[PDB]
Amino acid sequence: SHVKDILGLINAFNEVKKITVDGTTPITVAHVAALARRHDVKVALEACRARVETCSSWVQRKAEDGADIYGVTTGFELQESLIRCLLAGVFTDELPATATRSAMLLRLNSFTYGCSGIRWEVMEALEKLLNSNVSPKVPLRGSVSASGDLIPLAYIAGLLIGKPSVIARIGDDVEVPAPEALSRVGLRPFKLQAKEGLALVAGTSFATAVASTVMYDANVLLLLVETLCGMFCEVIFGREEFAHPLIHKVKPHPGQIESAELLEWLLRSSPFQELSREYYSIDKLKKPKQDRYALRSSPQWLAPLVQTIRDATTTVETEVNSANDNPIIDHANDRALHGANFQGSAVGFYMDYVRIAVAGLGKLLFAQFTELMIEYYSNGLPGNLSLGPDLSVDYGLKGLDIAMAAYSSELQYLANPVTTHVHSAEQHNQDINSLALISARKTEEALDILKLMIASHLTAMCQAVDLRQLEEALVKVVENVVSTLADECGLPNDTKARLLYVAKAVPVYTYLESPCDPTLPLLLGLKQSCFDTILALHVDRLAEFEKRLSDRLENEMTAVRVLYEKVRIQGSKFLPFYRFVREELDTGVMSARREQTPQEDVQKVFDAIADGRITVPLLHCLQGFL
Amino acid sequence: SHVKDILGLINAFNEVKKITVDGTTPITVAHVAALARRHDVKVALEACRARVETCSSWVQRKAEDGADIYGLQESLIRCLLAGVFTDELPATATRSAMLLRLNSFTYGCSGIRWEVMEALEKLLNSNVSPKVPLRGSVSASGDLIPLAYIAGLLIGKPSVIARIGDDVEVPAPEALSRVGLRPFKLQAKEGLALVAGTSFATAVASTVMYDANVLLLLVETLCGMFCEVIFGREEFAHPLIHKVKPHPGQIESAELLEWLLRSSPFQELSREYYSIDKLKKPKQDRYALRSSPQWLAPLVQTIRDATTTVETEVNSANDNPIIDHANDRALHGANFQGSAVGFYMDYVRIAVAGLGKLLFAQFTELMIEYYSNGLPGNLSLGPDLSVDYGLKGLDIAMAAYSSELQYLANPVTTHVHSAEQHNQDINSLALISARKTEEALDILKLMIASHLTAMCQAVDLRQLEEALVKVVENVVSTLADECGLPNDTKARLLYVAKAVPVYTYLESPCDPTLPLLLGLKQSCFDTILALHTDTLVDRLAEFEKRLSDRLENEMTAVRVLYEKVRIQGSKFLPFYRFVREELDTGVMSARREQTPQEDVQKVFDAIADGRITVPLLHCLQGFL
Amino acid sequence: SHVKDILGLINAFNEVKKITVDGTTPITVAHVAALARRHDVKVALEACRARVETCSSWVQRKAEDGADIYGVTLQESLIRCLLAGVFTDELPATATRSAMLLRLNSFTYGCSGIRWEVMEALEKLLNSNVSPKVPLRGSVSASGDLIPLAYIAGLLIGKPSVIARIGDDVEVPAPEALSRVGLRPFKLQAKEGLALVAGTSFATAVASTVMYDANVLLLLVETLCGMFCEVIFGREEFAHPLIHKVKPHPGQIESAELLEWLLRSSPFQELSREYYSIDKLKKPKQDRYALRSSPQWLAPLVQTIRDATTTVETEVNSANDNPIIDHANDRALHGANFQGSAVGFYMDYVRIAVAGLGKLLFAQFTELMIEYYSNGLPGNLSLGPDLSVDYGLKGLDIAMAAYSSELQYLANPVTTHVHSAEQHNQDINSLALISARKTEEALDILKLMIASHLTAMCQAVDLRQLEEALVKVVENVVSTLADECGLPNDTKARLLYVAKAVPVYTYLESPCDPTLPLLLGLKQSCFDTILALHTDTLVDRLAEFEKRLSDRLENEMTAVRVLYEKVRIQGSKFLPFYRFVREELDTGVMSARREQTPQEDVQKVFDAIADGRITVPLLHCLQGFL
């Protein structure tokens, strides 16, 4: 199951201490993201040294004898004129330090295969620069990722040779010219030898770097969305039967089988499904017999998205663990091979697909959130998940709802392809080019939006948990009060049962605002039954009932709500999430008596998604799934 | 290799006589496409009839016992006959949908009566199909509206028009009558079982995927032909390059190309070309050839993976509720949600645009003298270029094709509206997306037709080039002797004959401002300098004037003789023999009356109707 | 002419000191950009005050006698639910302050019912450089830019959770910011929440600076087409009035009118005419489409940018909240002026036209880089002479493909992605702010492209001036050497023709290399003259001519070039640009001997475009055009 695979990526991301760069051990997207995000993670380049020096020697010696090799004795001092012409970005905005360090890692890794001809010493400086948090400041734009990420990779090369015009960061604050930065790590500027410039600049390392953190994020956010579909079922009063294994067995898209399996398992002994079953047995024939598509067709919807994100992961890893410059030095057979491994099309095209898949995840979230906000579609929940009880001053999550439309709309726009925009480039030499870095940045942007939408959805769902539990205790108060008052006023066993059915059946949020308002559904249902009881038994005791109802009911309803603001989740697989958001992030049910704005509440959830903390409640939630 | 899988697809498409519909044997996209395109292909529904009737009974008794299970038949059909004829889904698509609908029922999950399945079988084998409006489906509770027309036929709705073969259109009840069928009276769940599936989107997506594999393999193969005609360096396909960047589609396309090019007689010409003036010609090819395997990689992988996905859908139960008769329960889900197909249709449309861009970049190089390594502009033979604009019209059209193709490749799945009283708040739009990918494949066929035509033109021009340089060498060689020029001079003069690209002076070979005379004039001056005399000048002035006695006439002769060889040793011979002999074409010129349209139409039609698979399989004979 | 109108816009941007906010004087996009970018520009709210108070009191009257009017007869609960954004990125201070101006201005029509005192506080915050930190996303611009405008309201009422900037570094909670500028938090009255949050000010603010830049860059691109004509050896005939008279799109007539005028007395068009008169039959009779069809291309772009300007200004000068208080007739009118669709759709269109501008630039730049298309210029505009170590502007060429590609991708529409939002109440919504933001990103790229293009054309001017000088040196050396060796008139005139005819950049790298075009052409003519005059004596003198040529010629080509490194532009209408880039910004002809990277040169041009300095040489260039 892709589920086990993704938990694998998360475990690795958290547990990895050193990244082994040795020309044999595969680097994964977790490793790339870990190096990028956790500064305690160190590169360990393992002396593959033999093959690196053999390649390096071959190239150097062939250059002497005038072998006719491209980018060595051919046009594109020959090496540094190439760096100079490629130092051609503009600061308008820049590639982030995380992407630059990831790129330095991928470049280093590509050299270990012994196909590039770079000197072992250059690799050692790359390793050292990474472990000392030194990285060049790199302009955002300029690459078409075809002869590689030439311009942005020239800033790494520019660092290595001490161009005074390249600015390096050292940690978060220090910014000094490149020669100054090499001084501080005990390095001197390299003087580039044969093919070394081309080896440094002509790779896929920048696109593939952005694509790696993109793909680790996509795997994690994917599993998160899938999981939260289970939570959505619980709060919306869904029918877990949509995830029945036979439905998916007869339409066996692997991602449709696997997501449904996660969901069946997540809901098997759900105490919320218990409540759902009961809700649908009351007024049985007046409520929908099936859920709406955002829940009911989620496994069918998730299927191509799972498969896209998983296959794209394989592709980006293949790229990560590749020699991606040119020529490819085949030293064992004494020849330089002329190809185009720097063409970043594998990554470019899969970035376009992943952005569309991410947009599809966003649309699933939007549709679920929309249902949750509307009383006609939320099976008892109040509009905008407003607690009130005074609705005139509690518009609930309305602002978050409007934002969810804004998020989804911009996200769908972003998912148009970049790879359809190929220009005939570089004096028409690069007449196909992958635009992979550009596509990877757009997909990254799309993930930024998905994270916002996940944060909002989880927040709304936590709010829905509270509202559902509050509903269960509120109904019990109404049932108790109606029951005991019926005793006091000495009403018949016909009238009692009839009035208790009403107490059980009316959705409490329809009259929470003013429980004894004669125009609201509680007293309407009660009036109806009172008339029915009269004709069936054919009064003083009834009229005293109605009076004694506006003595006890409202006060006892307030009392219980007030208690709650100062349970079924405990038995739910989603407890870890609820506990995380309520306890660990220090939040509570949203209302006019809670000072914090939606911003303050969702910011906490968003930050937790952004920094990886969300993976703890997620891993807890899924414990035991096999 | 995906290459062998695609060959297997083509073989199965060609061979199959009967499609086994049995609930166990997979239907592939080759079968769907064969049913659609070859009317001698018949459906054979195998009496799975047991589980079909069990399921049917379970539903039919839960109705007589008056149980209450959610999921009157004619009212569902009536509200869904809601399309409009502006345009329509073609008979090939409708018949494909009928097959997939038929197949969906075999798993015994749907509850439709067996006799309805028999009726579908009969209608398919009788070439009866309803006329179906093009639009209306969001492919979520299925392709409701379009599938409603098949159900409308089965119940003999008079407003539903049915085709019988290519010429006969009759109202539904008359079409049923003509095949010995009577209108059905639908039973419990049967209306829903007929309408609530993914069969139309999946039908289009099947013919789209079959076509995508064939055109993919064709484009990959023709990259080798491109190498041959452009004077490429075959070394871009070397297995090691691709072993160290091991995307499966990169390895596998390079593999085919290494093999296609290994003993190539054009590669031999290419080598001799880069040996002459070696250090004044490009060391590497441009990206449209040299990075073709890297480019092809994601396209091969996308088209292969999408094929798996669409075939899974072909072989699914995709209505609702799903009847679990064994466990006495109707299961409420949404297998009618076409999202697996929808998403992959968007992806394939992007891959198809990528194949188109590869073709456009290659064709562009071939038209431009600066990038074509000796070939004339527009692949114009002339010799008189003022009245021969060659393939310029096809060049312009290739930009037209690529531009529209790139536009088509924007996604459909990003346009999800909250639909049907907000019940279908997610919906796949699979049929719409599949239609756009189909439209994108139509344009790619145009681009392939054009590209292959242009390469056959280039084969002719390369063969003519070799024979023309030989004439020039002989004329220079023999005249040198006859004028009594020294061996110094003769050899210098012959080098020029060898080295100057013939298409740069073919127009007027003895023109003193054109590259042949220019090269000979500089060589004549260097000879005078190297040997110093008045006699030498006499013989050199004689040599020059006697050039316009013979040269032109002999170049014209060998040309006219060609109009009225290396390709025989090339793996692409079958393609060239197919386009030239079988289709009846020739080297394009002002002297050949046929328009580019006439030539390219022939190639296009052969691609359209699958005849092109014959030279393709021939070409790949022996590849493992 | 739109040219005068755009010149008016720039003059206004430059010379404005106070923005009159009075409810009758139109605010133009120049005024908005002036306010955003020039902090010395102050808002002057001119007491208009009378109608504001009438409206204010009407609303407060109804609040007093308890009338009941939807939308008017609470505020802090509206603001609270709308503070629902998340910091991921933020709307920049320049956008926020522009939004504050537009919101202030909207109130001046007396239709909003906001208190004059709130207005004066807006003016004061503006003039004191206070603005809220506003999250980037959340608006669908339909019931207004609700979420982002809530942060302005949150500042005004002193919400602690609302962080305010004061100038560039200072960030303080909202109460502190108000206190630093001598204001106190407001208690919002009836209808004031809505007045503040329910408008189009954010989208229209971004759109205003977008339209000012679109106008300026448009004129700049139009003007630089003439510069392109000069350096590429174009035929100015393409701009002839009769061509455009018979196809009279207003933007086609006016762009061509400008270009005809820029090129009328061009000293470069003189070199061009001379160039085509030598070997007339071997050189193209017409320019390629990026020049020859530039008027037809620019036409829809001119017209889009101008009509879009009108629309955006109409919106700047509007009351755009709801309900519309018609105090005069004792009514509140219920509509939807907060629906940002006028701006949303026109932002989509302007983004497409900007993409069309970028494509024009990309195609021009492409021609310029390729010797086959550049009529004498070296590939990549490489000076060399040693081209093996001088790849010239190849980096910038690659960057231009990257720029154009991402730009075309951005130009897909946002308005096609309308979701059914806010409980399906906002079932149409404009997405205006999202679209404006994408058009702004498109303009960022266009700025990059213009910077590169202008830098390339300055390089080309230098190469053209050197070319004229080099050919003169060659002619002189050949003319003098022919004399010194006593060559006949026949020989001398053939040899001098070759000197004039052969493009100097094809042999500059090694002028006496016998396989390069100078010697090739000389050898050819020498054979022709030996035949025409037919002797042992002539051959003697031709050999001595050749040996003296390889002693002297190169030394004298180097000298003139080295001197050039340490004229026709002086007569050119583009002198201001050239002088601006070379002297003002301190740059020089690009080569292996100039230390500054392409980055450092282009940064300087881009910075001048980005901060407005480029309008000086632009306005200088256009002096006299009426």
PDB file of N, CA and C in Angstrom, chain A residues 147 241 247 250-251 253 256 289-290 293-294 296-297 300 308 319 323 326 338-339 341 343 345 353 363 371 422 429 431, chain B residues 70 141 235 241 244-245 247 250 284 287-288 290-291 294 302 313 317 320 330 332-333 335 337 339 347 357 365 416 423 425:
ATOM      1  N   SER A 147      19.959  22.445 -21.321  1.00  0.00           N
ATOM      2  CA  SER A 147      21.375  22.113 -21.213  1.00  0.00           C
ATOM      3  C   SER A 147      21.646  22.137 -19.720  1.00  0.00           C
ATOM      4  N   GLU A 241     -20.134   2.926   4.365  1.00  0.00           N
ATOM      5  CA  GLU A 241     -20.366   1.952   3.312  1.00  0.00           C
ATOM      6  C   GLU A 241     -19.758   2.313   1.926  1.00  0.00           C
ATOM      7  N   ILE A 247     -16.915  -2.703  -3.357  1.00  0.00           N
ATOM      8  CA  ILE A 247     -17.166  -1.616  -4.322  1.00  0.00           C
ATOM      9  C   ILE A 247     -15.909  -1.418  -5.158  1.00  0.00           C
ATOM     10  N   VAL A 250     -14.401  -4.438  -7.542  1.00  0.00           N
ATOM     11  CA  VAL A 250     -14.919  -4.506  -8.919  1.00  0.00           C
ATOM     12  C   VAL A 250     -14.568  -3.310  -9.818  1.00  0.00           C
ATOM     13  N   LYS A 251     -13.770  -2.373  -9.314  1.00  0.00           N
ATOM     14  CA  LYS A 251     -13.244  -1.243 -10.111  1.00  0.00           C
ATOM     15  C   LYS A 251     -11.850  -1.001  -9.558  1.00  0.00           C
ATOM     16  N   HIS A 253      -8.808   0.196  -9.522  1.00  0.00           N
ATOM     17  CA  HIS A 253      -7.665   1.122  -9.591  1.00  0.00           C
ATOM     18  C   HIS A 253      -6.945   0.975  -8.265  1.00  0.00           C
ATOM     19  N   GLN A 256      -7.633   3.481  -5.742  1.00  0.00           N
ATOM     20  CA  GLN A 256      -9.024   3.422  -5.303  1.00  0.00           C
ATOM     21  C   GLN A 256      -9.179   2.300  -4.248  1.00  0.00           C
ATOM     22  N   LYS A 289     -30.601   9.238   1.374  1.00  0.00           N
ATOM     23  CA  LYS A 289     -30.183   7.850   1.561  1.00  0.00           C
ATOM     24  C   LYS A 289     -28.698   7.638   1.215  1.00  0.00           C
ATOM     25  N   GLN A 290     -28.106   8.597   0.506  1.00  0.00           N
ATOM     26  CA  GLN A 290     -26.684   8.522   0.144  1.00  0.00           C
ATOM     27  C   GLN A 290     -26.009   9.846   0.408  1.00  0.00           C
ATOM     28  N   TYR A 293     -21.095  13.647  -3.330  1.00  0.00           N
ATOM     29  CA  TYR A 293     -19.931  13.089  -4.018  1.00  0.00           C
ATOM     30  C   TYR A 293     -18.578  13.352  -3.362  1.00  0.00           C
ATOM     31  N   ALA A 294     -18.448  14.493  -2.696  1.00  0.00           N
ATOM     32  CA  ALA A 294     -17.181  14.860  -2.069  1.00  0.00           C
ATOM     33  C   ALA A 294     -16.748  13.814  -1.037  1.00  0.00           C
ATOM     34  N   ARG A 296     -18.725  10.394  -0.788  1.00  0.00           N
ATOM     35  CA  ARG A 296     -19.078   9.095  -1.357  1.00  0.00           C
ATOM     36  C   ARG A 296     -18.157   8.642  -2.505  1.00  0.00           C
ATOM     37  N   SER A 297     -17.691   9.589  -3.321  1.00  0.00           N
ATOM     38  CA  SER A 297     -16.820   9.236  -4.445  1.00  0.00           C
ATOM     39  C   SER A 297     -15.349   9.582  -4.193  1.00  0.00           C
ATOM     40  N   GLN A 300     -12.742   6.919  -5.496  1.00  0.00           N
ATOM     41  CA  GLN A 300     -12.661   7.028  -6.954  1.00  0.00           C
ATOM     42  C   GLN A 300     -11.880   8.293  -7.336  1.00  0.00           C
ATOM     43  N   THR A 308      -0.607   9.297  -9.481  1.00  0.00           N
ATOM     44  CA  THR A 308       0.227  10.386 -10.005  1.00  0.00           C
ATOM     45  C   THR A 308       1.373  10.732  -9.045  1.00  0.00           C
ATOM     46  N   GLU A 319      15.853  10.742 -11.388  1.00  0.00           N
ATOM     47  CA  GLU A 319      16.612  11.963 -11.651  1.00  0.00           C
ATOM     48  C   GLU A 319      17.640  12.321 -10.549  1.00  0.00           C
ATOM     49  N   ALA A 323      23.534  10.550 -13.373  1.00  0.00           N
ATOM     50  CA  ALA A 323      24.564  11.455 -13.910  1.00  0.00           C
ATOM     51  C   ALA A 323      23.867  12.274 -14.984  1.00  0.00           C
ATOM     52  N   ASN A 326      26.971  16.326 -19.489  1.00  0.00           N
ATOM     53  CA  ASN A 326      27.334  15.918 -20.835  1.00  0.00           C
ATOM     54  C   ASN A 326      28.660  16.587 -21.208  1.00  0.00           C
ATOM     55  N   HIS A 338      28.301  11.682 -26.256  1.00  0.00           N
ATOM     56  CA  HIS A 338      27.616  12.960 -26.480  1.00  0.00           C
ATOM     57  C   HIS A 338      26.137  12.721 -26.534  1.00  0.00           C
ATOM     58  N   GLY A 339      25.443  13.189 -25.503  1.00  0.00           N
ATOM     59  CA  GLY A 339      23.994  13.012 -25.387  1.00  0.00           C
ATOM     60  C   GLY A 339      23.375  14.254 -24.782  1.00  0.00           C
ATOM     61  N   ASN A 341      21.720  14.223 -21.204  1.00  0.00           N
ATOM     62  CA  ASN A 341      21.190  13.908 -19.882  1.00  0.00           C
ATOM     63  C   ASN A 341      20.797  15.136 -19.078  1.00  0.00           C
ATOM     64  N   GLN A 343      18.794  17.299 -20.094  1.00  0.00           N
ATOM     65  CA  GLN A 343      17.414  17.621 -20.485  1.00  0.00           C
ATOM     66  C   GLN A 343      16.436  17.172 -19.427  1.00  0.00           C
ATOM     67  N   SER A 345      13.279  16.831 -18.893  1.00  0.00           N
ATOM     68  CA  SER A 345      11.893  16.543 -19.310  1.00  0.00           C
ATOM     69  C   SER A 345      11.134  15.517 -18.465  1.00  0.00           C
ATOM     70  N   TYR A 353       1.956  17.126 -14.298  1.00  0.00           N
ATOM     71  CA  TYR A 353       0.917  16.181 -13.861  1.00  0.00           C
ATOM     72  C   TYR A 353       0.585  16.334 -12.391  1.00  0.00           C
ATOM     73  N   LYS A 363      -9.725  20.561  -4.921  1.00  0.00           N
ATOM     74  CA  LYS A 363     -11.142  20.590  -5.269  1.00  0.00           C
ATOM     75  C   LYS A 363     -11.934  19.652  -4.331  1.00  0.00           C
ATOM     76  N   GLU A 371     -19.778  21.754   1.857  1.00  0.00           N
ATOM     77  CA  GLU A 371     -20.863  20.972   2.436  1.00  0.00           C
ATOM     78  C   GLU A 371     -21.026  21.277   3.913  1.00  0.00           C
ATOM     79  N   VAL A 422       7.065  25.528 -24.721  1.00  0.00           N
ATOM     80  CA  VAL A 422       8.427  25.412 -25.164  1.00  0.00           C
ATOM     81  C   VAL A 422       8.727  26.391 -26.305  1.00  0.00           C
ATOM     82  N   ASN A 429      19.461  26.123 -30.931  1.00  0.00           N
ATOM     83  CA  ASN A 429      20.090  24.855 -30.557  1.00  0.00           C
ATOM     84  C   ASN A 429      19.168  24.066 -29.613  1.00  0.00           C
ATOM     85  N   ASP A 431      15.963  23.544 -29.252  1.00  0.00           N
ATOM     86  CA  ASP A 431      14.639  23.674 -29.861  1.00  0.00           C
ATOM     87  C   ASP A 431      13.556  22.798 -29.178  1.00  0.00           C
TER      88      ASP A 431
ATOM     89  N   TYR B  70     -32.678   1.845  -1.631  1.00  0.00           N
ATOM     90  CA  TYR B  70     -32.543   2.993  -2.527  1.00  0.00           C
ATOM     91  C   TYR B  70     -31.566   2.737  -3.685  1.00  0.00           C
ATOM     92  N   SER B 141     -22.118  10.726 -12.083  1.00  0.00           N
ATOM     93  CA  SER B 141     -23.063   9.650 -11.809  1.00  0.00           C
ATOM     94  C   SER B 141     -23.058   8.878 -13.101  1.00  0.00           C
ATOM     95  N   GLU B 235      25.335   8.323 -31.744  1.00  0.00           N
ATOM     96  CA  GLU B 235      25.881   8.158 -30.412  1.00  0.00           C
ATOM     97  C   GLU B 235      25.002   8.737 -29.269  1.00  0.00           C
ATOM     98  N   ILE B 241      24.893   6.245 -21.749  1.00  0.00           N
ATOM     99  CA  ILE B 241      24.265   7.537 -21.479  1.00  0.00           C
ATOM    100  C   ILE B 241      22.986   7.305 -20.685  1.00  0.00           C
ATOM    101  N   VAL B 244      22.985   5.466 -16.963  1.00  0.00           N
ATOM    102  CA  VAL B 244      23.255   6.347 -15.807  1.00  0.00           C
ATOM    103  C   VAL B 244      22.178   7.417 -15.543  1.00  0.00           C
ATOM    104  N   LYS B 245      21.142   7.473 -16.389  1.00  0.00           N
ATOM    105  CA  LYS B 245      19.950   8.289 -16.101  1.00  0.00           C
ATOM    106  C   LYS B 245      18.735   7.411 -16.413  1.00  0.00           C
ATOM    107  N   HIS B 247      15.604   6.456 -16.444  1.00  0.00           N
ATOM    108  CA  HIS B 247      14.161   6.497 -16.671  1.00  0.00           C
ATOM    109  C   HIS B 247      13.856   5.421 -17.672  1.00  0.00           C
ATOM    110  N   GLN B 250      13.383   6.360 -21.167  1.00  0.00           N
ATOM    111  CA  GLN B 250      14.641   6.861 -21.749  1.00  0.00           C
ATOM    112  C   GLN B 250      15.508   5.686 -22.230  1.00  0.00           C
ATOM    113  N   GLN B 284      28.092  18.394 -32.171  1.00  0.00           N
ATOM    114  CA  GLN B 284      26.910  17.689 -31.647  1.00  0.00           C
ATOM    115  C   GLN B 284      25.676  18.121 -32.405  1.00  0.00           C
ATOM    116  N   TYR B 287      18.992  19.799 -30.199  1.00  0.00           N
ATOM    117  CA  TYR B 287      18.285  19.042 -29.168  1.00  0.00           C
ATOM    118  C   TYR B 287      17.153  18.159 -29.655  1.00  0.00           C
ATOM    119  N   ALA B 288      16.502  18.549 -30.747  1.00  0.00           N
ATOM    120  CA  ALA B 288      15.346  17.782 -31.251  1.00  0.00           C
ATOM    121  C   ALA B 288      15.709  16.345 -31.602  1.00  0.00           C
ATOM    122  N   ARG B 290      19.222  14.977 -30.533  1.00  0.00           N
ATOM    123  CA  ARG B 290      20.148  14.480 -29.503  1.00  0.00           C
ATOM    124  C   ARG B 290      19.471  14.218 -28.152  1.00  0.00           C
ATOM    125  N   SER B 291      18.456  15.013 -27.795  1.00  0.00           N
ATOM    126  CA  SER B 291      17.770  14.766 -26.526  1.00  0.00           C
ATOM    127  C   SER B 291      16.417  14.105 -26.702  1.00  0.00           C
ATOM    128  N   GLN B 294      15.616  11.484 -23.928  1.00  0.00           N
ATOM    129  CA  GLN B 294      15.261  12.158 -22.667  1.00  0.00           C
ATOM    130  C   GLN B 294      13.851  12.772 -22.749  1.00  0.00           C
ATOM    131  N   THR B 302       3.871   8.000 -19.543  1.00  0.00           N
ATOM    132  CA  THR B 302       2.501   8.504 -19.431  1.00  0.00           C
ATOM    133  C   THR B 302       1.508   7.700 -20.295  1.00  0.00           C
ATOM    134  N   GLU B 313     -10.581   0.429 -16.136  1.00  0.00           N
ATOM    135  CA  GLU B 313     -11.926   0.982 -16.224  1.00  0.00           C
ATOM    136  C   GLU B 313     -12.799   0.183 -17.196  1.00  0.00           C
ATOM    137  N   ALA B 317     -17.048  -2.974 -12.914  1.00  0.00           N
ATOM    138  CA  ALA B 317     -18.470  -2.692 -12.731  1.00  0.00           C
ATOM    139  C   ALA B 317     -18.551  -1.230 -12.267  1.00  0.00           C
ATOM    140  N   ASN B 320     -24.132   1.823  -9.905  1.00  0.00           N
ATOM    141  CA  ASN B 320     -24.439   2.019  -8.484  1.00  0.00           C
ATOM    142  C   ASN B 320     -25.955   1.909  -8.285  1.00  0.00           C
ATOM    143  N   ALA B 330     -27.297  -4.089  -1.003  1.00  0.00           N
ATOM    144  CA  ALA B 330     -27.030  -3.128  -2.056  1.00  0.00           C
ATOM    145  C   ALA B 330     -26.000  -2.141  -1.517  1.00  0.00           C
ATOM    146  N   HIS B 332     -23.728   1.214  -1.591  1.00  0.00           N
ATOM    147  CA  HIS B 332     -23.843   2.593  -2.042  1.00  0.00           C
ATOM    148  C   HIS B 332     -22.507   3.265  -2.110  1.00  0.00           C
ATOM    149  N   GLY B 333     -22.024   3.444  -3.337  1.00  0.00           N
ATOM    150  CA  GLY B 333     -20.714   4.037  -3.582  1.00  0.00           C
ATOM    151  C   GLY B 333     -20.822   4.926  -4.807  1.00  0.00           C
ATOM    152  N   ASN B 335     -18.850   4.226  -8.196  1.00  0.00           N
ATOM    153  CA  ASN B 335     -18.021   3.686  -9.260  1.00  0.00           C
ATOM    154  C   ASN B 335     -18.279   4.343 -10.611  1.00  0.00           C
ATOM    155  N   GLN B 337     -18.043   7.434 -11.053  1.00  0.00           N
ATOM    156  CA  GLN B 337     -17.158   8.609 -11.042  1.00  0.00           C
ATOM    157  C   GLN B 337     -15.939   8.349 -11.926  1.00  0.00           C
ATOM    158  N   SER B 339     -13.125   9.637 -12.640  1.00  0.00           N
ATOM    159  CA  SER B 339     -11.909  10.437 -12.358  1.00  0.00           C
ATOM    160  C   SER B 339     -10.575   9.789 -12.773  1.00  0.00           C
ATOM    161  N   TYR B 347      -3.424  14.131 -18.660  1.00  0.00           N
ATOM    162  CA  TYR B 347      -1.980  13.846 -18.697  1.00  0.00           C
ATOM    163  C   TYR B 347      -1.540  13.450 -20.094  1.00  0.00           C
ATOM    164  N   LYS B 357       5.512  18.725 -30.238  1.00  0.00           N
ATOM    165  CA  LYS B 357       6.585  19.722 -30.187  1.00  0.00           C
ATOM    166  C   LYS B 357       7.892  19.083 -30.663  1.00  0.00           C
ATOM    167  N   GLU B 365      14.095  22.115 -38.228  1.00  0.00           N
ATOM    168  CA  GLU B 365      15.519  21.923 -38.569  1.00  0.00           C
ATOM    169  C   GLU B 365      15.723  21.511 -40.022  1.00  0.00           C
ATOM    170  N   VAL B 416     -13.914  21.825 -12.568  1.00  0.00           N
ATOM    171  CA  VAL B 416     -15.020  21.145 -11.897  1.00  0.00           C
ATOM    172  C   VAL B 416     -16.025  22.163 -11.331  1.00  0.00           C
ATOM    173  N   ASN B 423     -25.198  18.038  -5.558  1.00  0.00           N
ATOM    174  CA  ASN B 423     -24.920  16.636  -5.203  1.00  0.00           C
ATOM    175  C   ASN B 423     -23.570  16.195  -5.777  1.00  0.00           C
ATOM    176  N   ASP B 425     -20.731  17.623  -6.377  1.00  0.00           N
ATOM    177  CA  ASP B 425     -19.807  18.710  -6.068  1.00  0.00           C
ATOM    178  C   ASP B 425     -18.349  18.386  -6.410  1.00  0.00           C
TER     179      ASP B 425
END
